[PDB]
Amino acid sequence: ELIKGPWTKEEDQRVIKLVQKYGPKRWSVIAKHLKGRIGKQCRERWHNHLNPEVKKTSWTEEEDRIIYQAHKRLGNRWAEIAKLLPGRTDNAIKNHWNSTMR
Ligand code: NA
Ligand code: NA
């Protein structure tokens, strides 16, 4: 019933299209359109990777410290580190690191 593993480009495209239709808060409804994926999965894929919005251009020291400790722990695993930062996607973190923390 439920599928696991990597998100395909087709699935990512689908989530974006459905968010435009239902908005960023009917995750269970959006999930009905994706084979084997549930609301929670779609929600996290959006907030941790797909969301194109930029709401905060500055970073706090608390965020930097979390990234630094996670990097020592895991290395350059942006997708995993993104799970630890409430308002950041993996790409946001990757760029912040290479231009300010590296
Ligand atoms: Na589904
Ligand atoms: Na995040």
Side-chain angles (χ1 to χ4, degrees), residues 47-48 82-83 85-89:
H47 293 299
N48 287 333
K83 296 175 188 173
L85 284 301
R88 312 291 185 179
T89 60

Side-chain angles (χ1 to χ4, degrees), residues 44-45 47-49 59 62-98 101-102:
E44 296 304 301
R45 185 64 179 167
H47 293 299
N48 287 333
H49 179 73
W59 298 66
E62 288 73 21
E63 288 181 292
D64 283 351
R65 188 168 297 86
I66 287 172
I67 298 169
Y68 173 92
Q69 290 181 49
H71 186 277
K72 287 181 63 292
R73 180 184 309 122
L74 309 166
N76 301 305
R77 309 190 73 175
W78 311 123
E80 183 63 28
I81 298 178
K83 296 175 188 173
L84 309 180
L85 284 301
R88 312 291 185 179
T89 60
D90 53 359
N91 263 71
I93 298 180
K94 181 174 65 179
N95 295 322
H96 178 57
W97 172 271
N98 288 307
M101 305 177 74
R102 191 181 61 192

Side-chain angles (χ1 to χ4, degrees), residues 20-55:
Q20 304 186 328
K21 178 177 176 184
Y22 297 105
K25 78 159 188 173
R26 288 191 167 80
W27 299 114
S28 54
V29 178
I30 289 177
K32 296 295 180 59
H33 297 70
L34 283 82
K35 172 192 173 181
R37 300 290 191 178
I38 62 178
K40 181 174 181 178
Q41 293 176 303
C42 297
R43 179 189 72 207
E44 296 304 301
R45 185 64 179 167
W46 173 260
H47 293 299
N48 287 333
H49 179 73
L50 301 176
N51 187 2
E53 79 169 3
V54 182
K55 185 159 63 180

